[PDB]
A paper describes a structure:
ADC-68 is a representative of a group of intrinsic chromosomally encoded class C Acinetobacter-derived cephalosporinases (ADCs), with more than 350 variants currently reported. These enzymes can produce resistance to penicillins, narrow- and expanded-spectrum cephalosporins, and monobactams. ADC-68 differs from ADC-1, which is not a carbapenemase, by seven amino acid substitutions and is still the only class C enzyme reported to confer resistance to carbapenems by itself. In this study, we selected a triple mutant of the intrinsic class C Acinetobacter-derived cephalosporinase ADC-1 (ADC-1TM) that confers high-level resistance to the carbapenems meropenem, ertapenem, and doripenem.
However, successive serial passages in media with increasing concentrations of ertapenem yielded the ADC-1TM mutant containing the Val292Phe, Ser318Thr, and Phe322Ser substitutions (SANC residue numbering). The Ω-loop in monomer A of both enzymes adopts a β-hairpin-like conformation; however, the B8–B9 loop shows a large variation in conformation. In ADC-1, this loop bends outward from the active site, whereas in ADC-1TM, it folds markedly more inward. In monomer B of both structures, the B8–B9 loops adopt a similar conformation (different from that in monomer A) but are ~1.4 Å apart. This difference in location is a result of the Phe322Ser substitution in ADC-1TM, where the smaller serine side chain leads to rearrangement of the main chain of Arg321, whose side chain now projects in the opposite direction and forms hydrogen bonds with Asn204 and Gln207 of the Ω-loop. Since soaking experiments with ADC-1TM and ertapenem did not capture an acyl–enzyme complex, molecular docking was carried out to generate models of the complexes. In the monomer A docked poses, the core of ertapenem is substantially shifted relative to its position in the crystal structure, with the pyrroline ring rotated by ~60° and translated ~4 Å away from strand B8. This movement of ertapenem is a result of the difference in conformation of the B8–B9 loop in ADC-1TM, which places the side chain of Thr318 (one of the three mutations) into a position formerly occupied by the C3 carboxylate in ADC-1. X-ray crystallography, molecular docking, and molecular dynamics simulations revealed that the amino acid substitutions in ADC-1TM produce significant changes in the enzyme active site architecture and binding mode of the carbapenem ertapenem. These changes allow for better positioning of a deacylating water for nucleophilic attack, thus explaining the significantly improved rate of ertapenem deacylation by ADC-1TM.
Numbering used by the authors: 3 to 361
């Protein structure tokens, strides 16, 4: 183990490992990628009932971090000419033609500015048929494009349209096109039976194992599962897109462009973006209740910040996910767990590790 191996292990042991006992989390995988070198730390149990330890093959649910793959698929479709972000959803989902939702464009769906879509579908919307009925009956409220409200229905519709534009179901868009283009070999929307023994159980607040299939249009919002080595490769592709072939390189760069600004945060496709260096308070504020749950007025970007960093939290439940990268520093970090941990704690631990790593 190199001098870097030891230093990084120590930093991760100092800042992430205590979270396991503090929040009774069965298992965790934490990785750092720096200058094309991976550093992987595994702790605890993949499955409590099986006494299977977390390892490099463990597959974790990504939760909301799944949206980063929806974003990449959309950047891919757009740069192949299959969609334009100025298109509306009825161009592709023909039953939405001549309905009010066909007045919202795809970029506005992908970046949560339709003006009338909340965090979740209404409780009564449970089947694919009911989702279509929901969108046909939809009416706008706030001026389209002017207010951000984080929303699983919003990006789910975006992902459904992306799949329609590529003439494949969304699961196939990821498993047959996007994941292979990124070199990921153990990332899934549907975990195959030959991998079930590697699939971590999620654990609720009562520490019981929980597994559920997605709701309607759920896969683009929270439906991806992946390993720590695969997620480090994904961060590498975001740090060095120029090393990848053009179609996926263009897709990745598309997810890095700021689309509008809310206070100190810039919304890109999937990724949240910040001027580097971002103070700890700026990163914490991006996960305030105000930003997460309320409608916030957006402002057009004058010019993008000159030096940037990017992160995404994978809230949900039965899992904790956090990913962050800094192009200037050629470094990034991934945290995966099989139990929820307060976002505040994920951000603080990653901030301390990244601020201490020697160049």
């Amino acid at each position: 183990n190199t001098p870097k191996d030891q230093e990084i292990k120590k930093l991760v042991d100092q800042n992430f490992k205590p979270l396991l006992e503090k929040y009774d989390v069965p298992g965790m995988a934490v990785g750092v990628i720096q200058n094309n070198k991976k550093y992987e730390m595994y702790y605890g149990l993949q499955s409590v009932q099986d006494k299977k330890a977390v390892n490099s093959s463990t597959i974790f649910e990504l939760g909301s971090v799944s949206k980063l793959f929806t974003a990449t698929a959309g950047g891919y479709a757009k740069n192949k000419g299959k969609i334009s972000f100025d298109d509306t959803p009825g161009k592709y989902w023909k039953e939405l033609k001549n309905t009010p939702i066909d007045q919202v464009n795809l970029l506005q769906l992908a970046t949560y500015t339709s003006g009338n879509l909340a965090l979740q579908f209404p409780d009564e919307v449970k089947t694919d048929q009911q989702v279509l009925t929901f969108f046909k009956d939809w009416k706008p409220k706030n001026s389209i494009g002017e207010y951000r409200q984080y929303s699983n229905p919003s990006i789910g519709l975006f992902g459904k349209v992306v799949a329609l534009s590529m003439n494949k179901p969304f699961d196939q868009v990821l498993e047959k096109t996007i994941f292979p283009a990124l070199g990921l070999k153990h990332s899934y929307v549907n975990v195959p039976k030959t991998q079930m023994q590697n699939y971590a159980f999620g654990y609720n607040q009562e520490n019981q194992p929980i597994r559920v299939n997605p709701g309607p249009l759920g896969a683009p919002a929270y439906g991806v599962k992946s390993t720590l080595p695969d997620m480090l490769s994904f961060i590498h592709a975001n740090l060095n897109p120029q090393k990848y072939p053009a179609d996926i390189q263009r897709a990745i760069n598309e997810t890095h462009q700021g689309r509008y600004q809310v206070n100190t945060m810039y919304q890109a496709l999937g990724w949240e973006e910040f001027s580097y260096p971002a103070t700890l308070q700026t990163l914490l504020d991006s996960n305030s209740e105000q930003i997460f749950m309320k409608p916030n007025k957006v402002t057009a970007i004058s010019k993008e910040p000159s030096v940037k960093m990017y992160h995404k939290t994978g809230t949900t439940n039965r899992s904790g996910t956090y990913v962050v990268f800094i192009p200037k520093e050629n470094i990034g970090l991934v945290m995966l767990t099989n139990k929820r941990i307060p976002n505040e704690e994920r951000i603080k631990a990653a901030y301390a590790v990244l601020n201490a790593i020697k160049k």
